[PDB]
Structure 1
Amino acid sequence: GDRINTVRGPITISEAGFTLTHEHICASSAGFLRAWPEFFGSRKALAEKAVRGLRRARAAGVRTIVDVSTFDIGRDVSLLAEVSRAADVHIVAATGLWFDPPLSMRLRSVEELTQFFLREIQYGIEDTGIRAGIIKVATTGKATPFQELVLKAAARASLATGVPVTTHTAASQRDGEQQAAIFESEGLSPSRVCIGHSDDTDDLSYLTALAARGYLIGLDHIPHSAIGLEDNASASALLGIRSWQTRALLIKALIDQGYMKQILVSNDWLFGFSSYVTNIMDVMDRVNPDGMAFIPLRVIPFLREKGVPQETLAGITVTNPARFLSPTLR
């Protein structure tokens, strides 16, 4: 556990630096960007845009982002490597499955899925040699049967490799509780696990109860808000109507209850988005022109102003990610 795999190769733990742990270059679907790149203008336009945003995040102090796009989010690790080199920002790539698995995934056993995630972690994604550094999974409410298999296989792959697991939840449904039960049924340590989208809820008791058990709490939706666009239903459905300040005060709340070491903060931002309504990216970029720089430009100052010490901010944004990403065998 002394090296993190990025899309440009292994980096030391101290090279990671200021890290965003839940981001995407592009949220799409398996095969889609290569089949229909004109949906994003062109592949070149998408890449140029990503590099712009990554360069601006780098200017604001971001050294590493974790791209948590799985196979079924249309992860294109060749694009990641390209924009990582061009922008000079480390990108950690993901294996796992999110909630749009095709038939050839859906029909697979826990054992088969375990071999797939291990392939992507140990040997490399597709034919690239680029090894994942994290496993993403997802529920949206109670796990479907397949989703239980995915979580169990993610737990098996993490135990074999030391690589952490990170989750999508419907927080309003307290998904993290079922996710934790499943992971613990496989003997996975809660410190290997980030329960994500957790700022979608204001149920602080749900959150501290998980952190108390050792889970990392991913407060990765801070800039996601449809305030001012409440008449755009597709945006409000996606973003919620809770303000960024409300979401950020959960970070303080967790800190005040003694759980600073369990917190991971991010934007869940992206430069293309095909797996929602057309032209959604335009809406999102109007909502948050800072994009991935929103955390270092708006959130960290806001917290500091509300009296969060520098030291605690550095812990959350540098230390916790390093601990989380360092591959760590039981």
Structure 2
Amino acid sequence: GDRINTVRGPITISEAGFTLTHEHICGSSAGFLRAWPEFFGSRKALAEKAVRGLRRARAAGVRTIVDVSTFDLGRDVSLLAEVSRAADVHIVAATGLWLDPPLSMRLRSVEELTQFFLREIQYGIEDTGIRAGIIKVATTGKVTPFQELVLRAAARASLATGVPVTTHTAASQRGGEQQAAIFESEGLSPSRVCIGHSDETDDLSYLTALAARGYLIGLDHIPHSAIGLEDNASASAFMGIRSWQTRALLIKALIDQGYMKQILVSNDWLFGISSYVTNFMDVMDSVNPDGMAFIPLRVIPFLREKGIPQETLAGITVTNPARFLSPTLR
């Protein structure tokens, strides 16, 4: 229709504006923020940092972010709603499952997972009445049996509600190809789907092929370059040796192939992280001081210097997310 669900309620599509389609307020685990807030210093501290971060993104032109933190990424929608009001930035919340599902999720059938996702979309998250506006899923190269169940549950929940699906992929392993095959076996329209972390490869033919089938290509790891850390056993597996300009030029390459309409760009940033090593957040902030403002402050100007016109950069950052997020059954 004409309305997108956010943590503050429904908004009309024209209100979304410049939208970052793959972000996080906090990368954690289910129940963790509540049970151990001092891991982040304090809940208040984490919130205040996130509010400053969003206001900084807002002053760079960002109007909406999509928080693709799932249940098992320890999504706290109450936190999302708080920081959204204070920063005057729309936040779309996610259902789905990422890569750390607990036992109570891992043992569920595709039918039960479908019910969980649908409840979070149609009824609300926890007892908050806040509804998800996107379904997030994740696979590791060769899709596992449980992951296949997740993707099919996501497909079915999308098909009943018209909300889009967005994925975590290992692009180096061409992971989107198995994701796409599963989605298509369920009769899901590719234009409901973003294949994420896609800038983690130099294989353009892989990307272009997905695009040509109608998938959105999520180029969301541009500031995850991490230059110089090939000794750090934490910042050499996580992140690599590909410059942000190298990644960003994939955006240009896809535009030149005629697939500007299939491109989504983001940062995959956050303001706290507990799912990795202690103080990884300091590592990330040191390497990307712009945080969520990296896309509008660096990547957009870079693309302009490379001769990408304003109307195209507007289509990618405003029109493309809008079309993606608006619930549609085609």
Interval containing the TM-score (normalised by the shorter chain)? over 0.9
- 1:12 corresponds in structure 2 to 12
Determine if contact 1:20/1:64 at 8 Å carries over to the other structure: yes
d(CA) in 2 for partners of 1:236, 1:293: 24
Segment of structure 1 superposing worse, 229-238 or 296-305: 229-238
Q: CA deviation at 1:233?
A: 2.2
d(CA) in 2 for partners of 1:230, 1:285: 18
d(CA) in 1 for partners of 2:125, 2:89: 20
Q: CA deviation at 1:329?
A: 1.3
- 1:200 corresponds in structure 2 to 200
Q: CA deviation at 1:309?
A: 0.6
Determine if contact 1:138/1:167 at 8 Å carries over to the other structure: yes
Q: CA deviation at 1:239?
A: 1.3
d(CA) in 1 for partners of 2:90, 2:306: 30
TM-score for both structures, normalised by structure 2: 0.99
d(CA) in 2 for partners of 1:321, 1:236: 31
d(CA) in 2 for partners of 1:73, 1:229: 26
Q: CA deviation at 1:242?
A: 0.7
Q: What whole-Å deviation, never above 9, does each CA across 1:164-206 have from its counterpart, x for those lacking one? A: 0000001111110000000001000000000000000110010
Q: CA deviation at 1:212?
A: 0.2
- 1:148 corresponds in structure 2 to 148
d(CA) in 2 for partners of 1:101, 1:241: 30
| Secondary structure of 2:85 counterpart | helix
Q: What whole-Å deviation, never above 9, does each CA across 1:207-250 have from its counterpart, x for those lacking one? A: 00000000000000010012123322201211111111111000
d(CA) in 2 for partners of 1:225, 1:216: 22
d(CA) in 2 for partners of 1:268, 1:253: 21
d(CA) in 2 for partners of 1:140, 1:238: 14
Q: What whole-Å deviation, never above 9, does each CA across 1:113-149 have from its counterpart, x for those lacking one? A: 0000000000000000000000000001111100000
| Secondary structure of 1:238 counterpart | coil
| Secondary structure of 1:223 counterpart | helix
Segment of structure 1 superposing worse, 152-161 or 237-246: 237-246
d(CA) in 2 for partners of 1:324, 1:165: 9
d(CA) in 2 for partners of 1:119, 1:311: 38
| Secondary structure of 1:328 counterpart | coil
| Secondary structure of 1:237 counterpart | coil
- 2:266 corresponds in structure 1 to 266
Q: CA deviation at 1:5?
A: 0.2
- 2:233 corresponds in structure 1 to 233
Q: What whole-Å deviation, never above 9, does each CA across 1:64-121 have from its counterpart, x for those lacking one? A: 0000000000000000000000101000000000011001000000000000000000
d(CA) in 2 for partners of 1:114, 1:229: 41
- 1:24 corresponds in structure 2 to 24
| Secondary structure of 1:96 counterpart | strand
List alignment gaps of at least 5 residues for structure 2. Answer: none
d(CA) in 1 for partners of 2:172, 2:224: 15
d(CA) in 2 for partners of 1:224, 1:123: 35
d(CA) in 1 for partners of 2:98, 2:233: 24
Determine if contact 1:190/1:215 at 8 Å carries over to the other structure: yes
| Secondary structure of 2:224 counterpart | coil
Determine if contact 1:7/1:92 at 8 Å carries over to the other structure: yes
d(CA) in 2 for partners of 1:140, 1:31: 24
Determine if contact 1:225/1:236 at 8 Å carries over to the other structure: no
d(CA) in 2 for partners of 1:203, 1:233: 25
| Secondary structure of 2:163 counterpart | coil
| Secondary structure of 1:99 counterpart | coil
Determine if contact 1:53/1:291 at 8 Å carries over to the other structure: yes
Determine if contact 1:269/1:291 at 8 Å carries over to the other structure: yes
Map 1:1-330; keep pairs closer than 5 Å.
Answer: 1-330=1-330
Could you tell me the percent identity over the aligned residues?
Answer: 96
d(CA) in 1 for partners of 2:236, 2:226: 5
d(CA) in 2 for partners of 1:276, 1:205: 32
Determine if contact 1:23/1:270 at 8 Å carries over to the other structure: yes
d(CA) in 1 for partners of 2:59, 2:306: 24
Determine if contact 1:216/1:263 at 8 Å carries over to the other structure: yes
Give the number of equivalent residue pairs: 330
d(CA) in 2 for partners of 1:312, 1:240: 29
Q: CA deviation at 1:14?
A: 0.3
d(CA) in 2 for partners of 1:195, 1:324: 12
Segment of structure 1 superposing worse, 292-301 or 233-242: 233-242
Segment of structure 1 superposing worse, 224-233 or 212-221: 224-233
Segment of structure 1 superposing worse, 243-252 or 220-229: 220-229
d(CA) in 1 for partners of 2:109, 2:231: 43
